[PDB]
Amino acid sequence: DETTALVCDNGSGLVKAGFAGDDAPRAVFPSIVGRPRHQGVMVGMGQKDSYVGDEAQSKRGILTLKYPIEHGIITNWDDMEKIWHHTFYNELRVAPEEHPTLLTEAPLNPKANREKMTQIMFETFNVPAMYVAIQAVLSLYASGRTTGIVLDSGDGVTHNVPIYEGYALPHAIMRLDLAGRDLTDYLMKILTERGYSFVTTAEREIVRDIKEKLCYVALDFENEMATAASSSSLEKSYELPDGQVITIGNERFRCPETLFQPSFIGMESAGIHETTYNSIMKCDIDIRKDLYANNVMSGGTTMYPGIADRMQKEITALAPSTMKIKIIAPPERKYSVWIGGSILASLSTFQQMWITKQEYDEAGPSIVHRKCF
Amino acid sequence: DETTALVCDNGSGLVKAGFAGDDAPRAVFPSIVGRPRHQGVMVGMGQKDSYVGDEAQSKRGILTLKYPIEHGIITNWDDMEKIWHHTFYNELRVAPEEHPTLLTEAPLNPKANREKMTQIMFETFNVPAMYVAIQAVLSLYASGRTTGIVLDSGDGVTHNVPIYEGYALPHAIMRLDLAGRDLTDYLMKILTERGYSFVTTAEREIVRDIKEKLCYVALDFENEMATAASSSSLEKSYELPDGQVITIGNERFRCPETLFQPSFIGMESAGIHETTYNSIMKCDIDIRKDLYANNVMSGGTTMYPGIADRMQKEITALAPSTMKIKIIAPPERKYSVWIGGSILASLSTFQQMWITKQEYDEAGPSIVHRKCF
Amino acid sequence: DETTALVCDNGSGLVKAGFAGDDAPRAVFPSIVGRPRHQGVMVGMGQKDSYVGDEAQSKRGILTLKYPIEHGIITNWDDMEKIWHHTFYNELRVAPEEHPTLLTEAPLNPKANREKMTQIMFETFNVPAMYVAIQAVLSLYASGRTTGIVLDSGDGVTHNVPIYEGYALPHAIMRLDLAGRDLTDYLMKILTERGYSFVTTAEREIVRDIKEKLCYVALDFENEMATAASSSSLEKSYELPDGQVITIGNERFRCPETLFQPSFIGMESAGIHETTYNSIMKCDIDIRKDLYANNVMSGGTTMYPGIADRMQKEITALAPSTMKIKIIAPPERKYSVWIGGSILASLSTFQQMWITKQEYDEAGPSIVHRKCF
Amino acid sequence: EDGVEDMTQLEDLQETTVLANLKTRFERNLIYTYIGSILVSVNPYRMFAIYGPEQVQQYSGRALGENPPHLFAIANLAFAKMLDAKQNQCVIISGESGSGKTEATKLILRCLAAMNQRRDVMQQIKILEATPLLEAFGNAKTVRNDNSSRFGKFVEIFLEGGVICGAITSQYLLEKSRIVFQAKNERNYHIFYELLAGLPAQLRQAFSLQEAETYYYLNQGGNCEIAGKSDADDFRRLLAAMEVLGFTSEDQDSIFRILASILHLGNVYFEKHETDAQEVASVVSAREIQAVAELLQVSPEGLQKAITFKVTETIREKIFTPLTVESAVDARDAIAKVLYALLFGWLITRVNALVSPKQDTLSIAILDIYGFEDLSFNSFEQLCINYANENLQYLFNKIVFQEEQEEYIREQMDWREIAFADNQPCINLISLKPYGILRILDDQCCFPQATDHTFLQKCHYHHGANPLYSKPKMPLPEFTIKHYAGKVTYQVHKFLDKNHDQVRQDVLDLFVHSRTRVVAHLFSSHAAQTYKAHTVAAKFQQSLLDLVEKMERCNPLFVRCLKPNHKKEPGLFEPDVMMAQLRYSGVLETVRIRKVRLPFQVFIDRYRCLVALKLNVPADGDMCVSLLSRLCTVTPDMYRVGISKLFLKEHLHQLLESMRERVQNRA
Numbered sequence A, B, C: 001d002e003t004t005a006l007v008c009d010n011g012s013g014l015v016k017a018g019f020a021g022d023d024a025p026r027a028v029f030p031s032i033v034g035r036p037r038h039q040g041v042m043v044g045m046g047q048k049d050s051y052v053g054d055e056a057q058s059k060r061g062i063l064t065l066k067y068p069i070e071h072g073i074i075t076n077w078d079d080m081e082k083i084w085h086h087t088f089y090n091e092l093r094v095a096p097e098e099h100p101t102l103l104t105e106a107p108l109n110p111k112a113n114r115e116k117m118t119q120i121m122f123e124t125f126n127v128p129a130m131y132v133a134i135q136a137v138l139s140l141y142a143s144g145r146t147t148g149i150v151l152d153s154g155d156g157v158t159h160n161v162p163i164y165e166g167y168a169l170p171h172a173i174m175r176l177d178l179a180g181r182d183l184t185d186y187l188m189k190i191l192t193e194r195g196y197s198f199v200t201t202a203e204r205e206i207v208r209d210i211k212e213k214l215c216y217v218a219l220d221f222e223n224e225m226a227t228a229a230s231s232s233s234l235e236k237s238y239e240l241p242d243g244q245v246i247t248i249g250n251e252r253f254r255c256p257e258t259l260f261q262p263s264f265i266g267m268e269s270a271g272i273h274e275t276t277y278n279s280i281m282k283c284d285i286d287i288r289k290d291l292y293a294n295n296v297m298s299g300g301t302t303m304y305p306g307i308a309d310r311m312q313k314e315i316t317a318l319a320p321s322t323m324k325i326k327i328i329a330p331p332e333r334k335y336s337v338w339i340g341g342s343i344l345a346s347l348s349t350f351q352q353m354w355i356t357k358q359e360y361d362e363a364g365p366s367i368v369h370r371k372c373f
Numbered sequence D: 001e002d003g004v005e006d007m008t009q010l011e012d013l014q015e016t017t018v019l020a021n022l023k024t025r026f027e028r029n030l031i032y033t034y035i036g037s038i039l040v041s042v043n044p045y046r047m048f049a050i051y052g053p054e055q056v057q058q059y060s061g062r063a064l065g066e067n068p069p070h071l072f073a074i075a076n077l078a079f080a081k082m083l084d085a086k087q088n089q090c091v092i093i094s095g096e097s098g099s100g101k102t103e104a105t106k107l108i109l110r111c112l113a114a115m116n117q118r119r120d121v122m123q124q125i126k127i128l129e130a131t132p133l134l135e136a137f138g139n140a141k142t143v144r145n146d147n148s149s150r151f152g153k154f155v156e157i158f159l160e161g162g163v164i165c166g167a168i169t170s171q172y173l174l175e176k177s178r179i180v181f182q183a184k185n186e187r188n189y190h191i192f193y194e195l196l197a198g199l200p201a202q203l204r205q206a207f208s209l210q211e212a213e214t215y216y217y218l219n220q221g222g223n224c225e226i227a228g229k230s231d232a233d234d235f236r237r238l239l240a241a242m243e244v245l246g247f248t249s250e251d252q253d254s255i256f257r258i259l260a261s262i263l264h265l266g267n268v269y270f271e272k273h274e275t276d277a278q279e280v281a282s283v284v285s286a287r288e289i290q291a292v293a294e295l296l297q298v299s300p301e302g303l304q305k306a307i308t309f310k311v312t313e314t315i316r317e318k319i320f321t322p323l324t325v326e327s328a329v330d331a332r333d334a335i336a337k338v339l340y341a342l343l344f345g346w347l348i349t350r351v352n353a354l355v356s357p358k359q360d361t362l363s364i365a366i367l368d369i370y371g372f373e374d375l376s377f378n379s380f381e382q383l384c385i386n387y388a389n390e391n392l393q394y395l396f397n398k399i400v401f402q403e404e405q406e407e408y409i410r411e412q413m414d415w416r417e418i419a420f421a422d423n424q425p426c427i428n429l430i431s432l433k434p435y436g437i438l439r440i441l442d443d444q445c446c447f448p449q450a451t452d453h454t455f456l457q458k459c460h461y462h463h464g465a466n467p468l469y470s471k472p473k474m475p476l477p478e479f480t481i482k483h484y485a486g487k488v489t490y491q492v493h494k495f496l497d498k499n500h501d502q503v504r505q506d507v508l509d510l511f512v513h514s515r516t517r518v519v520a521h522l523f524s525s526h527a528a529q530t531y532k533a534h535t536v537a538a539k540f541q542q543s544l545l546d547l548v549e550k551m552e553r554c555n556p557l558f559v560r561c562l563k564p565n566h567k568k569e570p571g572l573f574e575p576d577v578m579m580a581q582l583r584y585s586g587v588l589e590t591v592r593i594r595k596v597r598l599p600f601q602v603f604i605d606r607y608r609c610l611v612a613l614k615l616n617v618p619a620d621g622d623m624c625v626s627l628l629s630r631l632c633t634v635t636p637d638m639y640r641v642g643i644s645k646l647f648l649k650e651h652l653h654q655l656l657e658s659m660r661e662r663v664q665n666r667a
């Protein structure tokens, strides 16, 4: 009867899991699987062949860390099963065979990904029901709006979804394979100019922490670079795990600049502002005014200081001066997809949109293409 | 059924033998073989052609003493057989053909040494099983830790082995051919400045006793030398076997100083502190903090008064001030390798890691390279 | 008027210097500085405090040899000045204050290295002009091509640079800190298995000579090891300076194997073949076919017998069977960087790309960042 | 006359049938029943005629035929087997505490004393008076019973052609971890509370004792008083027993001194002081250490070093290594446990020497052993208990299978080899040397950084594929073992803390050089007798192996005492309680082993309407049985035919019932 649904926002970098109706995810941990890369010499020490989540980062210095998801696509289907098993049993401490599960996926992913998630849910974990949602719709659900264009940016992909009065325009949906992971790689590359070498996968986590703590978005790039070159007031220090101290200057704002200039990492694509403007201009002329004032930002990559100010400046430069530009960046936008999924999964009217086990048995794994979206 | 294993820690200078499960070695005696060098004139006196162990030191004044092991490598394979036979029969009073034997070896020795020990154990003494262990791992076993870097120093070699959570990093293993025997030779050399001449191998033992009883490590070398030169309060007397009394001053701390300045004996290598720091810096950046606080010292050469204080001072000078440096020097570190071997050989899970006689018969003496380490 | 330019390819291990327009370097000598480590007892013998180049290897047995460059970064700035002074005056017998100088550097080095080289050239040696080039571009210049991916490997670093029709793709540039020096260290480590101990810096040169003369690359590692273990036809002898003869077997091909399996020396990086394939796959889909057939190998570490065959085999295994794989390994690839630099410095159109003394005086040492690359 | 005595003769033996027959017997005030040669006794909580000389002469010898079941039948059967085989025999009285094993043992002792010697009854008087001492030193209050024996009493009555010689009492499988650790709502052994309650005041002032709530070794349960027990009266009765047993005032004073020393040693705490390279435990207050030293006549500094230091002693030197807080705690607990064990052994040795026999040619052994234990919270002690019970169930199943084979051979049939799956896999799962659970526990007790979680992970890894071993779904700190009595879940919470029982040579040397004679004698004897047993589990396994090795030179006889109701109501019975007791006592193992016997006449007279209309053959035999057999088209390999009995009924019974109901469906 009272079977609480499970909301699992398995992103490329973080797993956000919890119960429907809650205000925050119950379990948040990195989506990594680690394996030992050294020689075990003590008897009985070395009987574990895999580490998932936070225990993979506690043992970070002897493991090889691998991500099962790149750019929103699950490429390793055994590590993904390990991560899902960890989430269901060790983290949520719940039995999946008695809870409906709600999962999320990027708008323009291959269909085999969704079919394989459906098969794994219905055959390995024996869930009673299933649904796969689109992350931007859940961002709107969490934002308390029915009209707006969502710029979601995790660390796999960046996509734009314009929605008006609950109606989506699929032809105006954008997608970029440029997100937090590429920012971490670019910061790792440009940290070599000061003589800092981060090579292994365990140092990728240190570089990611540096990026989260120190990096920010400059309102204007050229004068910021001139100020950084003409003085030393923009430099900050960071302490490495072994006690060494590093210092970074213009690398603080040069790393997030690749979101607006993808040419830094050798991509021909346009910036996030131009992508958003292009997505808006692909909609009806009667929809554009409402979309201009409902720019909803979601994801962890949108958490840089000053990113909303620059997005508003760029859109104002692009859009006509008559329109009013608003960038909605709630302080909890890092969990907006999960919050929206929790809101949606707790609705009583939503109970008729689940993919039940009987429907799967009847129609194969392809039922998810007509039941979802 | 209940066949107790034998632990034999045959070092370069001392043999430490006993039964697995005990708290201390049963037999400890010098690893020397002596032969007469004078003329026997009494009928019936002089029928013994060799003396092994303590009986070789009782007759020290008519014998030529030779060590079968230099720098952890067995160079005389008949004297080594004599010593092993003595250990098994006259000291432990046990029959080797019904007890598994555990032996130790330095980390970076030639492979022929290990193969020859395996062949001698399986063909001359007919042991039912065999294992060859690494001394630093046994030091960690005795210390009750799974993470730490071990500085073992007997009188053949000095080596560093960093281990984290039971995983060894073989690329960071160091080795020095500078240990107690070189210290004895250097003390013998610098004792000639006061007119004391020790030439024969029997006087090497007297010099070794002097080094064990009087030598110590100075916290700082230059001010210690200044104090020793400006006064006479650091001088101590020693009584020779025939009653003559010798006095030594700055030679008390100049002898152990060659551990930190190998240039005194004409070596280009770095001190033990710099070797330990270099071994630490060859590990992962996430391992260094735990290793800095788990510096385990083992062996007889680490028994000098004040050696741990100077090691901590030198590592603190080298390592960043943020880290916390701890030098673990248990009072029983002279027997830590044997204690760890005894702990390891008594485990029930270890019974599957022995090299049985059948495996040797199948695979030749080269089985020890894949079964051990 | 007719001021001939100087090309100085100062690598981590060798200095390759000469005049622009020549077909071969005029001066080739090791990049070492030696200092006495023993006691001078004869009056007048011991008045020299430093030895640079070949004279540092003639006196190898009384000196401490140090390299001013590790992994392509100058760490000792006084020894580097000594080496440059030696090159300019004692080797080339030329006055640097009247010849433009062309220098080389690894693609992803710290900027302080380049700025300091510029400052030293313009303030200590008073050169009239300067340029800093990238070694892979010079390798292509020497190879007579405008399209291709270059695998340069000296003894400091290994890097990949893909270039198409004279256009470089900086985002696809790879770098490894694994090269000839690490191979020498690994060979020194694995030579202890047969009982050969090389410790001092003077024995590092002997080990390097052994590696150059005897080591080779096996087409396949496992069957080569099986053949070496099952017979003794792969063993060769080497004569040490004092007459002792050493013999090595599988160490001949186990040493260069760390280029394809960096895990032997405890690195998590991928082999050179996988690094090259990854660099190719980071380029445009329309560039890959031309790059697959223009794999240019440069440097001294690429001089092992059979390295090109194995590189082709590995790339063929990785790349699709439709493409055609060609490995270009000219017999003079040890000097390809210098040959390309000589070709480039002699061009008449290149005379406008020098960094003149006036530009340096105007813009400080930071002019090299915008004038070069 | 509706009930039956022996259920072996029944044609269909099922759990429901056994329960129905047992409750029918109990409702008629018939307590004892028979399973072959195995007796079953239900505690009635009411005085019943289980005595009287007329019963003895009625059961005297083989003149009765065992038509009525009684313990005297077990006694005279053991006597007859001894006189036939000229060999010893043992009778094993198992069952839960309070199920009636104690008075069963006393009645057996009285019956043997009455029927063997019948001229002198001094042996039974001398062995009965030692019972209160053992009960006080070996029982404790648990969460299931108010007086439970935590050990196995082994009474051996020596006989010489009907002449009762001296008796030897032995103890086995004593719980060592209860002396220092008690769970919620349970106490330590009764002796400590009796001593603290009924001691004279000036003795308490001399020993500086206080109320039981202050002591750490007793207050862990939180309920130091039993509602319905008088400690002073029992303590005075114990004094009377010691006075009868020849224990002088000096011996009693020494025993009280030892117990007070244990109690005071239980109240020592340690602090984490900072040393140059480690953390070192130091005693908080030296008052308790000095009190223990004064009570035991040992050096105070020697005791403090034996508690807070570790000695590595070779021929040429002796090194003192400081211990941690946990290591010091383990050392103190090990000292307390060894002191208590030595004291109990000394008491039993003195009692045996008081009634020492002369010759050793024949003997009757009586074992009063506790049974299966399945509580709510389940831990190491019950794991050892269930391991011992599994090893006893092995012999029980061996006896049952021997009786089954004897039944098969006695009937005029070609005796086949009957399949039988013993409980060896469970014993191997618990205590096999390579990767047994107890072996893993022993290994983790010396491993550098082992805790309960690591031990659980090792157990899960090594036994994940065992059918008997089961893992919890969620990561709970527990595991499940499928015993013969069902699935039992063990909570791993202090397995490593309860297993550390290592006492080093320095402590033994300190205690040998005491100024009192009894303690010095005990520790000298212990050192002379002492071994690679450094843990509680290893010593328990050694003691159990000794007990088993004492028990293969004889054919055991089993007495299974049950419980009809947990409220001790004399007459009230429940079916679920009977099912639980039958599962725990191992009675249903006989039913499991059986899988099936029917007389030839029964089914001929019953199923005659399945093939023909009414086939009333006048001449019965094996030929008509075979005719009705292959007229039904049934393979001969799934059944067997003899004279009348041993007609195997694996699956033919179900199909025969189905055909019978199908035939009767029309009419």
Ligand SMILES: Nc1ncnc2c1ncn2[C@@H]1O[C@H](COP(=O)(O)OP(=O)(O)O)[C@@H](O)[C@H]1O
Residues within 6 Å of the ligand: A010, A011, A012, A013, A014, A015, A153, A154, A155, A156, A157, A180, A181, A208, A211, A212, A213, A299, A300, A301, A303, A304, A334
């Ligand atoms: N405060 C922050 N500043 C900058 N980047 C951040 C911050 N917090 C998270 N990130 C980046 O966002 C990415 C994770 O965001 P998330 O939305 O959880 O990704 P996904 O949904 O794909 O798992 C990581 O690469 C992380 O480095």
Ligand SMILES: Nc1ncnc2c1ncn2[C@@H]1O[C@H](COP(=O)(O)OP(=O)(O)O)[C@@H](O)[C@H]1O
Residues within 6 Å of the ligand: B010, B011, B012, B013, B014, B015, B153, B154, B155, B156, B157, B180, B181, B208, B211, B212, B213, B299, B300, B301, B303, B304, B334
């Ligand atoms: N108290 C001490 N002070 C200084 N040196 C000592 C002391 N005890 C032993 N040694 C030295 O340590 C060496 C022996 O140590 P040990 O660890 O037994 O060597 P090995 O293991 O190689 O046999 C001898 O050279 C001895 O002189």
Ligand SMILES: Nc1ncnc2c1ncn2[C@@H]1O[C@H](COP(=O)(O)OP(=O)(O)O)[C@@H](O)[C@H]1O
Residues within 6 Å of the ligand: C010, C011, C012, C013, C014, C015, C153, C154, C155, C156, C157, C180, C181, C208, C211, C212, C213, C299, C300, C301, C303, C304, C334
């Ligand atoms: N024939 C050879 N076989 C193997 N290795 C070689 C050979 N010749 C040179 N090397 C190695 O290549 C390295 C020097 O190559 P080079 O390209 O001159 O380095 P760099 O440019 O960094 O000075 C040295 O370590 C040397 O041992």
Ligand SMILES: [Mg+2]
Residues within 6 Å of the ligand: A011, A012, A135, A153, A154, A155, A299, A337
């Ligand atoms: Mg996301």
Ligand SMILES: [Mg+2]
Residues within 6 Å of the ligand: B011, B012, B135, B153, B154, B155, B299, B337
């Ligand atoms: Mg040693």
Ligand SMILES: [Mg+2]
Residues within 6 Å of the ligand: C011, C012, C135, C153, C154, C155, C299, C337
């Ligand atoms: Mg080069």
